[model samples]
Target: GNLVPFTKNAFKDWCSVNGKRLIILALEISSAVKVNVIDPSGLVRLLSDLVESQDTFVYLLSYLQRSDLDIMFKRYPQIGLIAENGNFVKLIGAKNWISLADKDELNSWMPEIVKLVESKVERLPGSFCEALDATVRFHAGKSFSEDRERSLDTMGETIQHINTLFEHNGVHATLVRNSVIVQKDQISLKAIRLVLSCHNSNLDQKYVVTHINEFQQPMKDDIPSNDHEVAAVLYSGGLTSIDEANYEYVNSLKKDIGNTLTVTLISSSNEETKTAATYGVRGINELLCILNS
Candidate 1:
């Protein structure tokens, strides 16, 4: 009832998002991630497909801040910045941003969570830690500086205590992992398409833990650690363009209502809107589940 009006016009048409610029209102926005997209163009076709099939919306992932994301807010205050990885560090609009360790969760366990990863990198326990450490060493130079830092920072063979922290909190969202080749980049049409596929997914809202830099926890290690013999890592794909390596891991989502098929609402000119709302509406249901849940 209430949602019907809000959801329909949310992004039913380009004008829906544009008109706000003239008046000065927020642009209702959402985001998602796709672990990988092989064919960039294929991804576009996919968006067009889903957008035409079911009332869907499609948006582009971007690195441009001032020109793209920042401008997006100034022009349309409703939309927020959508970032990726295990922890989405991209903070969108003031009103639209979503955080892993939000206020409610922070109020409940900020200090406690800090104790977990504080002053040192929190590590897994027992064989799990050992196994992860082994994997990190094995992969060695095959990963990005950031990936290696996070992976090895917590490397442990004998495992450590399951300390305290919102390490769990940031883990709730996006993820993007990939193979790095010879300190180079590899991008592919297929890889990009798959990533864009998240746009075609069934959801309205979205996110996943992607970047750990944004985590409010302390990242440090006090225990003595021994370095491992990591070989020159190489990947056949990510050697040319960084897209494949960069687009490998992502935590895109699908906003679903409950378990059953969603009863999508209408809130556009055709429907009745006094509320909010794109191009394609993929992942709407999934995003809804995340928001309302």
Candidate 2:
């Protein structure tokens, strides 16, 4: 088969034609609130200031976490903003703001806040290392190699196996890899568990699971045409799983945005992976239903 070179514009057009909108909104925390506020006067003035403009999709950037701020601003009738953790409230009519918090602050307050919010909305924690260890040991035997590269590959295989089993039962699944580098000789299993915990409150569905895929591969010049496929691949260096900060950052965004965005965890033969697998099956289905409706 002959190969065709893929340009950025072609890919963008394909995604748009297929009703897929990929808007990457990167923001800094200090300016998150200011950027999200909707002002007609400001917009009018800003537009007037432009002498000539080319038509291009405006990729709004922010220091916030939640991408739903824009969605909320657009869909104001059905949802309302409420204070979940600190002084921040889901800003009504603003796109989801990915709230940035200090580790100590988030750790200290988020659990209690999560407990309270869980009473009102669907909440699920994402995958953690302890869960992974349990899943791995259960299926692959108690004895295994401690080598990091081998461990990651094994984890990837385990996730693929889980996905295959579910797909055989007529369920669609995708596993995202996650990994961590333990640099210091000091590493705590408990800390790993805490780090892998995928927690999200305010889920509209019965439950939600989020997975992280941490494998590294070279970038392809083309996009896969499969509509059901969703992946974030690495282009330059090796791809790694979401780190502690990334996990928390992603979770906080989910909390603020509501259901407009969804996250899932990939599972393996281990306990953590199993937990992620179970959640992925349910969560992905729920997302499809929501998309259909």
Candidate 3:
């Protein structure tokens, strides 16, 4: 019956009709503690699933070969990748890549970068290959006792001895990563949003996020809209579940925000036997019908 109204006016109405879009932040929370070993086969399977998922962006820390990385670039060009503890950033087939590591000159600086890093750690973090190190290590330390605290010391040592050498030796691969929060050492969901949102406005939640107390800045989270739904899958690794008071607080926030944004928490299990079928996983409710039955 609607086909009978085929015309410019009718076409305009059709184009204006409501539609649905869901952006997924496919993140792997932690690797070593969360999973004993990264099985290359398991990564392949996950990639196969993520590739088919609609409006999804991925942040993966996997053990892969140069061939695999090149193949990934050819296949899923927009993927956000960080390998070997942020030592190397792969810009091949990326969206909005903005970092301290000068992408244009990175290729040229490889020889110098490797020589510098290898001198210290006697190793290159190895993003596929090339013997590269994390050109930038943002410092977010407050106060530390010599014996009680060494994280800041190590971070500084790594940067001062390793990262800074790039610029000191005239290599542009050095990164001046911006950091207000004292953190790191996790598979990134925040990094995923930063990289992908650069190319696609629809995916960006808008505004910069920060730690609760650091610089009096609050984390910018997904906002709601009348036409679209924005959401995230956060990994609560340290906690088994949210407390009653915290749950109510989240509900209060969501109530104020309306249906425009939603954030769902999932268990970031370090259990030896933990599978993809971890209970309380968001959107896995659909599989309940088949997997359990």
Candidate 4:
């Protein structure tokens, strides 16, 4: 409720300090991405410049697949990616996408989930189901504000039923917008760790462990401290749904970094009335201004 406008000058000045930053930018947030294309050239050019500078590391977080983002990745292979809502990650310079969940375990119950979803779809017109690598999404026409009450209640009950049957197996279901997304637990937390590990690996020598060998001890003799030399910023289009939970987890990563780690939300006038983000901007244009600053 105490949201404030984002100031490009202030963020620019903050980033100009003695340290660097790790940015987690959501590509499909609001109008930042239009019709499956990442355009306006300015954003792409700025990202290219940032990655080339070496001080800033960028990760594009999206709900799309790795192949769907091949166009942008081909242009800047150094950029990291978190696709399929964190079910998969492609670290910078990595050859292939890494699956965060167990494929066999996820696939074991796919047929049952599909059967249940298809049964509902047969009675509900305009409703459909999409099967992802480790998740299944059910989109309801009633979720689009046409039958706000009746449809939501019906879908809500189904989601509860689905979770009741699968919760013991680490599978969960959630209703966001007009879709019921079913997936495993702690996915957002795992995705956040990948970003944090990258940031930690670049800090002081004591914390500069290799990404592949992150669990190993560093060779530095300096006193180990929680202070981080680099800051982190989690930027997204909207701070609702899963993004809100993600921002909360990201905020917990600020050990001794003070105000360096922050969350910025891009509101395109279609967002909720309130958010838990540190700063808010009008739209994608203002977001580009902050980066270009």
Best by lDDT, which number?
4
The C-alpha lDDT values of all candidates are: 0.25, 0.25, 0.32, 0.64
For model 2, the stretches where C-alpha displacement exceeds 4 angstroms are 1-146, 168-293
Clashing pairs in 4: none
| Candidate 1: tens digits of C-alpha lDDT, residues 1-293 | 24332233332322222111110011122233232222323332333333232222223333222233444435433222332211122322233333333445435543442343333233322211111100111122332254655554443311232212223433210122322111001112222222222232321224323432123333221121132111111111111123222312221111111111112223233233221221112243433322222
Clashes of each: 72, 44, 4, 0
Model 1: weakest 10-residue lDDT segment is 129-138
Expressed as tens digits, the lDDT of each residue in 141-202 for candidate 3 is 23223221343444345455543444443423222221111112221333333333332344
Regions of candidate 3 where Cα sits further than 4 Å from its true position: 1-35, 38-67, 72-101, 105-110, 121-159, 163-191, 194-229, 233-293
In model 1, which runs have C-alpha deviations exceeding 4 angstroms? 1-56, 59-95, 98-102, 121-153, 156-293
TM-score of each: 0.24, 0.21, 0.35, 0.79
Candidate achieving higher lDDT, 1 or 4: 4
Per-residue lDDT over 159-238 for candidate 2, one digit per residue giving the tens place of the 0 to 100 score: 45444543333222122334321111111111221121211112221121111111011111222222322121101001
Q: Supply the global lDDT for candidate 3.
A: 0.32
Descending-lDDT candidate ranking: 4, 3, 1, 2
Q: lDDT (0-100) at residue 240 of candidate 2?
A: 20
Q: Tell me how many residue pairs clash in candidate 1.
A: 72
TM-score of 3: 0.35
The local lDDT score (0 to 100) that residue 182 gets in candidate 3 is 13
Superposed on all Cα atoms, model 2 deviates from the true structure by an RMSD in Å of 19.2
Q: Report how far off residue 177 is in candidate 2 (Å).
A: 6.2
After TM-score superposition, what is the CA distance of residue 76 in candidate 3 from its true location, in Å?
7.7
Judge candidate 2 against the unseen true structure and give its global Cα lDDT, from 0 to 1: 0.25
Q: Looking at model 3, which ten-residue stretch has the lowest summed lDDT? A: 234-243
Identify the candidate with maximal TM-score: 4
